[PDB]
Paper text:
To gain insight into the evolution and designability of ligand binding and specificity, we analyzed the homologous PBPs, PotF and PotD, which are Escherichia coli putrescine (PUT)-binding protein and spermidine (SPD)-binding protein, respectively. They constitute the first elements of two separate multicomponent uptake systems (PotFGHI and PotABCD) to transport the cationic polyamines PUT and SPD across the cellular membrane. Still, the protein-binding modes differ: PotF shows affinity for PUT and SPD, whereas PotD exclusively binds SPD. Prior to this work, we grafted the seven differences in amino acids from PotD binding pocket onto PotF; this resulted in PotF_SPD, which will be referred to as PotF/D throughout this work to keep naming for mutants more concise.
We introduced the S247D exchange into PotF/D and into our high-affinity constructs E39D–Y87S–F88Y and E39D–F88A/L. The combination of S247D with the other constructs led to an affinity improvement with which the nanomolar range was reached for the first time, while keeping the order of affinities in the different mutants the same compared with the prior analysis. Nonetheless, all constructs regained PUT affinity in the medium to low micromolar range. All structures but PotF/D–S247D adopt a fully closed wildtype conformation. PotF/D–E39D–Y87S–F88Y–S247D is the construct with the highest SPD affinity (840 nM). In this structure, Y88 is stacking with N65 and the salt bridge residue R91, stabilizing the latter and thereby adopting the fully closed conformation. Furthermore, the hydroxyl group of Y88 is coordinated by E66, whereas R91 is interacting with S87 in two alternate conformations. Taken together, the interplay of the mentioned residues forms a tight pocket surrounding Y88, thereby stabilizing the distal region and supporting the completely closed conformation.
Residue numbers in the entry: 29 to 375
The structure:
Amino acid sequence: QKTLHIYNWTDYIAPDTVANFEKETGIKVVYDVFDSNEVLEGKLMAGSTGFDLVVPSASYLERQLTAGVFQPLDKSKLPEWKNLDPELLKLVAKHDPDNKFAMPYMWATTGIGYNVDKVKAVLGENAPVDSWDLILKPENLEKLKSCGVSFLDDPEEVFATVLNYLGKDPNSTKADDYTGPATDLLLKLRPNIRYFHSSQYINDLANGDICVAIGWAGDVWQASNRAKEAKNGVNVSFSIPKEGAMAWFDVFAMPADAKNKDEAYQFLNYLLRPDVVAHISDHVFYANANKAATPLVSAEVRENPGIYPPADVRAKLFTQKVQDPKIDRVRTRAWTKVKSGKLEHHH
Ligand SMILES: COCCOC[C@@H](C)OC[C@H](C)N
Ligand SMILES: [Cl-]
Ligand SMILES: [Cl-]
């Protein structure tokens, strides 16, 4: 009797995927969840995670490759590997050369989730919902404060978005960009931000408790769908803003010390079945990386340009770079200062 341990993002599988795999294979699954790349990386670098499969973003897989925390995937144990789109594989390979360590899972963008009606009530019918101005212009956040503003608790995402908005390289390697203009803007915004959190914003958007959030696309579409299902009269939408946004792939990987590799390959091959991953996309409102699955994904998901954006929008997307340790120090210190920003001092 074997037991497979999986560590995935919250809100990132269909409700019946694991039970269906358990029923089919007889394998018992222990499924645990996270909402932060930094939490997962800390576990991978601190000791044994005890997990057989983990799901980093691709730039987090990249940065940990030479640490040897992952073992290469034996493709002979993944006969359904050919269902993955081979062009998407080439893009993922920028982070994982020759696709040796990672199985692409889902792809999306980091944009703005918002309450359509409350934004228009507060900012007017002309509210700049197609722009990062909605959430990064202080004059707008000051007005939105009471209806509730959330930022992701993701320093890399937040600084890269701010840098881009300020007309800098979103992956700037210049320390002064972080300590100066990016920090200046974030401190100006900070009094109007209710919280930094990377998962509470889904239900808060759905229930009308947060009016604007920096959010991951399919999480915001899940909020929208939860409100629709609740018949609660809340209208949530998502914007990939006109100034561009971050795009990313999340990938399954196998820790080098995984106990139950055979069961792990069984689960990956299960996810490679087109019906399995299409059903996941239908529930989580994210694009998968499986070419064979695409015709099976629901029309509502496939036809949503905030899930499958067209070429003119894709042209404005950027990807995360791994920063050197001096930028990492500057950025992380600045993030701690920003998040503590409301506190009173006596110096
Ligand atoms: C099936 O995933 C949606 C397609 O993803 C779009 C991004 C990842 O690719 C860019 C290239 C140009 N197509
Ligand atoms: Cl990524
Ligand atoms: Cl359909």
